[PDB]
Design a protein around this ligand. Structure first.
Ligand code: HEM
Ligand code: HEM
Ligand code: XVF
Ligand code: XVF
Ligand code: H4B
Ligand code: H4B
Ligand code: ZN
Lengths: 415, 415
């Protein structure tokens, strides 16, 4: 069917036909909806040569039918040229223009990303000539320097060689290029980021010397062509950081918090015409709530609601005092204000969710729809005073796409 | 399959097998997830006699297999007794114990209700001997008096005669028993509740004399046995109200807000063993955010973020000042504090979402699962500092159930 989605704050109706092009599967059925399962066994991704040419043809048909040359001579010859090469090698190689298109549309198709209004402004760095972890480190550094741009952040992706057999894989073992370390204490508590305690100790295992503090930047663990991964330290001058202060409470500086400017995810898989790129770090800029709500106030992360409430003079005895809510707002005003006063790109959840509604309108117009995961798009605070709360959204999977993949340390043949 | 749901704040895993009993359909498919569509064409509900006995048998099998007498003599005789009566009349009549069971389990099965830990403490008022709108008014008044209990609120449902042919329907035209009126102005703005502007003018149409103010309690519009609906005014002494003040800001009293104590939905349909009860008003007590976030701060409702921010001395020029967020927290501390100081039952979104996680555990233990709609369960503010944000939830439809139904004024043969 050609389904309708409604906004209940403005009564706007849009018609989705793009879902007819949808290919992958959701995890839902007619009798169960799994839209709140985090890592369904569909959002995660070994493929053979028979299955490859339909996926190449499907992709190539979209590419040429977008540069305004569907079915022309250049299209049919590339169709045959790729057919021939999949016959010869049981794989094939994207042109540079095809790689840039595919990467931009994987982002365009990321239903859980609220930032996609920017999808066509993506800088693609082709690292498919990389062969060693040192080369990887070099490519990653250049990506971090470019994307940061002195705090005037620029979105970018670096794409390492595609998977071939499976035992020869390029992988970044870090989940993000820039992350703070987590250390478990002699008693039991946690210094730094509890999320990374396991990875912090893998770096310790392979040889890292930990400054065992709070906001210690982890080294990169880089695996090239299936070889064992090697440690490298991002030059500190390349890691831009923002000390968090408040435009009111002067005790807020004493909290001694700070965060890094560059959100750069490095553990996911990029799929383009049936080709799988197992190392493809991509970066943008932060929405404020990622740091102030999730990073700082998740119970299993930094978990600072306690201390901010104390210093705010809050009624912490009762739950219905909303002391947690009240400290959460101040923390997020602070993250935003610090980044802005330092000229580091950041977006608040009101501006970002408005832009995504604007983006949704454009997509239903010039595309017939916009796949969207409400569970992930609505921000983790103040949900219903943002316009995405009230927007019905259809979730479906289109390719090119970003997918989850198993962690390398559970699947790698070592020693 | 026998699926697993995970909590990512505590790493707890539960196994859902109850979804195998699921019967209805979600709206989702393998290729699209519609978990954010508000009123899917499945959550809404004319049935014949052939389809009726499977639904009666299915229901009767659950009922007897719960009072610890599955398949016994009393079960098989009621099975045959209902079979005989569906042969004779092409419908049938629930026993009183069956009605109480069915109603309690419709609530138990309401995947969008965060309050269900209380599902077994429901007071069921049998109004199936009702025949006139005056009788309806009398039954409703008694329900409002009982459920309110001097501010010590008690959950309750009143069940009017079941649908028979379709043209003879009991209906409450109000969407809730107690609602404030909405009036459009001579210029264009809105006094009172903008949500009810249409219904407020239907009461005006049928003869209501509007005190054209803010918090005017609407009359009841009651339709009995398919006849045209008639207006009745709930005695003011039965409508308990809470003036909203703040435990800090003394200008907050000057805002002149108040709300009613009793949330009582009256426009939905109760399905029990294939029988449809088109009038079945049910009431509980409020979660604070329903009033303070949605009722007061929705753009298309009372929309008070402006005035509270002004009186709070807020930087309203910029969006990233989070002045909206900051005023939203104060408004909700105020709703909670007013209700509590007046001894009117209310629950904060932290206590309620903790109880639902507790409830989910009980259901997976003694039931094999708990159908749950994440999109509706996560509260509309401070989502991720409540434990339901981090809880994966399977949504599926079980019967007995509450369903949506068309508004009566679009389907009724008038004059
Ligand atoms: C340019 C500014 C950007 C902003 C403000 C932004 C914002 C966000 C946010 C808030 C999330 C939710 C993440 C979470 O809560 O953990 C997200 C998810 C995501 N973003 Fe964007 N993002 C941006 C750029 C990008 C870029 C450049 C890419 C890829 C080239 C990308 C791809 C994704 C993907 C694949 C996900 C979710 C993965 C999944 O769970 O399936 N984003 N983004
Ligand atoms: C006892 C205290 C109760 C609390 C605290 C509570 C809380 C809630 C809340 C917050 C919602 C979301 C509504 C919205 O956001 O508009 C909800 C929905 C709902 N509640 Fe409960 N509720 C309670 C009692 C009941 C009772 C007694 C019934 C029926 C007998 C019931 C049935 C439902 C249904 C059917 C829905 C959602 C309908 C739908 O959208 O499909 N609730 N409840
Ligand atoms: C493991 C699953 N979760 C943790 C439970 C994290 C997954 C995840 C997957 C993404 F693609 C993703 F972008 C993020 C947020 C980081 C980010 C990146 C960019 C480019 C911009 C931005 N603004 N933010 C988190
Ligand atoms: C028309 C769809 N929406 C508006 C878009 C409203 C539907 C709806 C359907 C319910 F069953 C429902 F309970 C509510 C909240 C009112 C309520 C009732 C009770 C018993 C307890 C409580 N705490 N709250 C709203
Ligand atoms: C259980 C639930 O799916 C999980 O907590 C999700 C909910 N929505 C989210 N949304 C975003 N943007 N990021 C997240 O990490 C999550 N977590
Ligand atoms: C579009 C979206 O489905 C709609 O705004 C829903 C979202 N979740 C909700 N959740 C609750 N509890 N109440 C609501 O009215 C809504 N509205
Ligand atoms: Zn679904």
């Amino acid at each position: 069917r050609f389904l309708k989605v409604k906004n209940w704050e403005t009564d706007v109706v849009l018609t989705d036909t793009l879902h007819l092009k949808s290919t992958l599967e959701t995890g839902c059925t007619e009798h169960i909806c799994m839209g709140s399962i985090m890592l369904p066994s569909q959002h995660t991704r070994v493929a053979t040569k028979d299955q490859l040419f339909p996926l190449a043809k499907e992709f190539l048909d979209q590419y040429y039918s977008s540069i305004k040359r569907f079915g022309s001579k250049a299209h049919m010859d590339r169709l045959e040229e790729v057919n021939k090469e999949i016959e010869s090698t049981s794989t094939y190689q994207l042109k540079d223009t095809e790689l840039i298109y595919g990467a931009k549309h994987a982002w365009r198709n990321a239903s859980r990303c609220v930032g996609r209004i920017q999808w066509s402004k993506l800088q693609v760095f082709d690292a498919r000539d990389c062969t060693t972890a040192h080369g990887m480190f070099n490519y990653i550094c250049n990506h971090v320097k470019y994307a940061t741009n002195k705090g005037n952040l620029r979105s970018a992706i670096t794409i390492f060689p595609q998977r071939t057999d499976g035992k020869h894989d390029f992988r970044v073992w870090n989940s993000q290029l820039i992350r703070y370390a987590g250390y478990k204490q002699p008693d039991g508590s946690t210094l730094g980021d509890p999320a990374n305690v396991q990875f912090t100790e893998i770096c310790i295992q392979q040889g890292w010397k930990a400054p065992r503090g709070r906001f210690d930047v982890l080294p990169l663990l880089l695996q090239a062509n299936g070889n064992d991964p090697e440690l490298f330290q991002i030059p500190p001058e390349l890691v831009l950081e923002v000390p968090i202060r408040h435009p009111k409470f002067d005790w807020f500086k004493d909290l001694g918090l700070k965060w890094y400017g560059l959100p750069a995810v490095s553990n996911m898989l990029l799929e383009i015409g049936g080709l799988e790129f197992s190392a493809c770090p991509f970066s943008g800029w932060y929405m404020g709530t990622e740091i102030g709500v999730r990073d700082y106030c998740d119970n299993s992360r930094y978990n600072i609601l306690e201390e901010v409430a104390k210093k705010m003079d809050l009624d912490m005895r009762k739950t219905s005092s909303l002391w947690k809510d009240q400290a959460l707002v101040e923390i997020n005003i602070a993250v935003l204000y610090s980044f802005q006063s330092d000229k580091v790109t950041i977006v608040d959840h009101h501006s970002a969710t408005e832009s995504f509604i604007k983006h949704m309108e454009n997509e239903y117009r010039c595309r017939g729809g916009c796949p969207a995961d409400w569970v992930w798009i609505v921000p983790p605070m103040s949900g219903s005073i943002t316009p995405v709360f009230h927007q019905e959204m259809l979730n479906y999977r289109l390719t090119p796409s970003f997918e989850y993949q198993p962690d390398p340390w559970n699947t790698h043949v070592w020693k």
